[PDB]
């Protein structure tokens, strides 16, 4: 089923980038009618501008020139119960750096009950020039190497110790 996974927080210049916003229902059997809207403010500004509004099946992009012709939908297709609102940036620029907001305007459907929910997922990405490897990844790699080498050194130490002891044992006879 759905798993709410957070978006990546570093786009690299001139390349592509997919901004995850996955907002799934508490019960997957319910049938909703969801559409989404995205708001975005550049780094160094205090506002929020609507950029694109996904609907039943069509994605309508606003007149913002920063995203003109370089964003395509990447969420659920043909569902009308979207449950996954992630847009794709093609040819990332240095202007795609700021705080995004993923508005999820869900409308669930029950027996005689039509609920109006609204989930706002906020994603902050920062455009860069070269992809920096994760600090967790690099420390885990160096610690794997340290673990391998230290266990090998402990092994060889115990090996040579028992070797000298059994050598003394066979010299005794």
């Amino acid at each position: 089923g759905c798993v709410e996974v957070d978006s990546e927080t570093e786009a690299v210049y001139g390349m592509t980038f997919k901004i995850l916003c996955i907002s799934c229902k508490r019960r997957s059997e319910t049938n909703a009618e969801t559409f989404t809207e995205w708001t975005f403010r550049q780094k160094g500004t205090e506002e929020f501008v609507k950029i694109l509004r996904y609907e039943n099946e069509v994605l309508q992009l606003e007149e913002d020139e920063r995203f003109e012709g370089r964003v395509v939908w990447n969420g659920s297709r043909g569902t009308k119960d979207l449950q996954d609102l992630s847009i794709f940036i093609t040819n990332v620029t240095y202007n795609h750096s700021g705080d995004y907001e993923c508005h999820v305007y869900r409308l669930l459907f029950f027996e005689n009950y039509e609920h109006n929910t609204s989930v706002v997922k906020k994603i902050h990405i920062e455009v860069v020039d070269k992809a920096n490897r994760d600090m967790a990844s690099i420390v885990s790699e160096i610690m794997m190497y340290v673990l391998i080498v230290v266990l090998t050194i402990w092994l060889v130490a115990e090996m040579i110790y028992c070797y000298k002891k059994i050598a003394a044992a066979t010299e005794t006879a």
Binding site: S76, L108, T117, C162
Partner: protein, 1140 residues
Amino acid sequence: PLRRISIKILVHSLFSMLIMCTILTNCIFMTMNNPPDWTKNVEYTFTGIYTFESLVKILARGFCVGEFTFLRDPWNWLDFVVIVFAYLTEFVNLGNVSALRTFRVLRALKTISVIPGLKTIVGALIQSVKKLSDVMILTVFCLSVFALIGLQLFMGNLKHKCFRNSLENNETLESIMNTLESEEDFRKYFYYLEGSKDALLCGFSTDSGQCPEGYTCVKIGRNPDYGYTSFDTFSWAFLALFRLMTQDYWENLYQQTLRAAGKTYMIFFVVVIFLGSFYLINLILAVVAMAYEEQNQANIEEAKCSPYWIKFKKCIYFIVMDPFVDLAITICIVLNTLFMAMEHHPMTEEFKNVLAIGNLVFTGIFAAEMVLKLIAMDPYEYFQVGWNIFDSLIVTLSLVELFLLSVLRSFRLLRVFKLAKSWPTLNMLIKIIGNSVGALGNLTLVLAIIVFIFAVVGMQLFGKSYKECVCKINDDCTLPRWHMNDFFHSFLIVFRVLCGEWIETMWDCMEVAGQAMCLIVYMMVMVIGNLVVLNLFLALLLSSFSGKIWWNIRKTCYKIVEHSWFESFIVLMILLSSGALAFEDIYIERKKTIKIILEYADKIFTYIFILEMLLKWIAYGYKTYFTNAWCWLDFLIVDVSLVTLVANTLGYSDLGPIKSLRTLRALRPLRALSRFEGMRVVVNALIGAIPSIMNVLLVCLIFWLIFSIMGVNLFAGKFYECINTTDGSRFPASQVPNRSECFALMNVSQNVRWKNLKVNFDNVGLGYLSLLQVATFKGWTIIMYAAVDSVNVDKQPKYEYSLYMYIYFVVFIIFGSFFTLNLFIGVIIDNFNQQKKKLGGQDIFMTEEQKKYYNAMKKLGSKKPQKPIPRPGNKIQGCIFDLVTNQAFDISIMVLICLNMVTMMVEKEGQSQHMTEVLYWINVVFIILFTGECVLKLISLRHYYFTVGWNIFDFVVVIISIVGMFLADLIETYFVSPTLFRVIRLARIGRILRLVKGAKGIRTLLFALMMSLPALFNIGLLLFLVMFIYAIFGMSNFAYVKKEDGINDMFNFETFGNSMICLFQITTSAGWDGLLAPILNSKPPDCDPKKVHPGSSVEGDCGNPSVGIFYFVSYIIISFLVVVNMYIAVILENFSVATE
């Protein structure tokens, strides 16, 4: 002179069989359920014969002495009360005419006294109940203790219902609840998950969940299952715990309680199952077995052209070739059965005529052998042989079909029983089936009489109400599948209650015809019927049973490998590498940090294990390495690990077999079998028993092959129906009568679909699966329903059109499940006893440490009375000493303990505040008087109070009760935690657990449990390792499968918690059909092969039927063998502690 003729006609087999035949006709008449008008005179002549026999024995016995020697007989009381009731019904009668009509069923109990031997059989049953007494007291005590536990924990949790949020008309919850009563308006305000009778349970905890958006959880309304499933009152808690102890639909209580309260109560259900259900059932079995076996031992020990014709005959006898043609006929029988087994529903006409010519050729061969052997064996000397007369019956029943139905064609299979004289295990099966109607024919007859009595009693009592209005238990206002309106359906219900399926029918029967009467009837059925079935089972079982620096390098490697430091390091790395698999679930694209850490610890672990393997090589030598099963296992696992490592690090390898071998990481826990001696010894026991397992499983495969070929002939392709996919309801069969019409319906509207059952008898493989479901009793009803609805191959099923294939399933259960699992258990206990006699007479599930603890613990069975205590010198202290020591004092203390038990019992959900506070204060005064007797016992025995375990337990429970009340105080003062409040209040049941101190019969069986705890811990280690491996396999494969039935957001294989919960459910075979049902589907529109699954890259929500069937069948079988292991452990330890 009238007494003379009276007694002379009394003592007569003619008179005896007259009475037997009239009561048999009366039993056939009792099943009418709506007798015609003319049967009044028939019942009149029945009661006339009864009165005539009664007055005959009166004339022969009493003769004006007051029928003294007559009524000194206990069996004539029955016929006396029967004629009393008959003449009362004939004369002025009560208004409860049907309630006295059901009293004439005792005429079927007259059979027990009329038929020989049945009096002795029921005498033996009554003698065995007198031994079951104490385990019945113990199971009452355990179900009451666990019912108080479940009450404290889940009081009112089952009332949770996801209620609306936006109530218009400015209404409130109470303003709704007072005004809404029909289920449709209940559904318009609560959740009601689209096809359920009850509303969806919700939860306040974070894991239980999960009210949908726009719905908040609140406990308002009735409990689920008409109100009968709850822990609200102590009586409902006791009923739900008896349901857990008999494991009747206990999986639904499991799922409901977990959904309402929280998944963390998996611990409560684990404890309840693995102690109450298993241990108490096996204690019932052990005491029944001991009683019956001592009965049997005491019983047996207290007992003890003519010359051309002759030339033709000699030539034929010479050509029969004694060493060869019998083997030719045996291989012909095997070929004929394996030729009948290749039949399926979709068959080409070529395959059809192939099978036709094949079976006609085979029956021709068998008829030829028949006629040759009759002419060679003289016909008199020929029929001298029972096997040959059976062959004659079979060949006649076969030739009756060549040029002249299905079941008659399904009788060639009995030929495969001819393999018996060559197959010793099949001979044992034949011997069991023959003893069932031989030495135990009277016990089987008593069982049949009991089932008939209960069937007709249930019918007479409840079949009126069922028709009065089913509209309580059914919305179409038609009879349910399991009712009691007919004798056949009432007998089906009684049979289903002989199996463990009483609760689902008890709910409906309660709703229609009163809780008190339905509880009495069903509990009598359960207790008496299961007692007699267990007696028959145990009877059959027991009756059948009885410089050369290279050498220095090798030595250093040897010391390194066998050092305890290195061994503990390897076990630690095994545990780490195993637990590192639990984190790889569908939520692994979150927590990317721990994802990376595990991805590198993977390489670390495989490096460590490669170094371990190379050290073991250099230390042992390839010879002793590759001649070690454990070393071979470790070597195979590290080989798979190394292949995956090199492939992924080399790249160009994420294709097919590589990603299919990555799944074999779930076998990494298997490296702990070699390390943990507790698991190693149980694996050795299973391995030693596996050959006899294979023999008996071969016999069972051949028997179930007979039954599955029969089932394929009966229901091959008849389970197809075209349900309406919106609600999933078969079409009325008046419109849409067959497949060609449903396809026109599917062209007209889109929501219809001609669908199969996915576990059916379409071929012998699916037949084996369906027989496994019917024999485990988990999933059998959905098969039986479509079977008895079957009409033809491409015909829409009609409701109970067959209705007598229920007989096919009854016969299969009785023979296959009952007899073959009897053979299973018997041969497995026999094998374990042979193994135990081989092992010097030692227990085969305990290591050396465990054997030492076992002996030091079995010493606690001391019979020596200790020195009581030295009395003090002080006068007042000596007075207090006798006051504490007096038996009146201790029995008064036990009486106060029972009164405390009752104080906790009268608690319930929804009580008034006055009731709550008076209960508070009664508990407080109980605690204060318990503490008072404790402290006065102390100031009497200051130094020697603590030298006794039960006195230590008394002090511990006093302390924990005091801290429980003080912690309630501190909670009301400082904290808010209802869950912790309940779990702390749980401590007062310690005072109740002190009842065991006086009841020696309960103390001995509890000591048996403590004796069996070590072996049970070893088997639990092995079972938990198997469950872990299967849980990782589940998380890898069966995550992302559809959530169809039995797999839901609460229970699934999505994460390690969910997967281990479903696996603990399945360990008791419960609901494995439901769990396997969404895995078995593929091939849209059963699923979607390319689904997006947001948050992950894996697509498709279909399961692989092959790996699903293998997974679930193998887990069923391995869990069966390990619970058989536990059952052997508890039986043997109870035998030991009972003898001493």
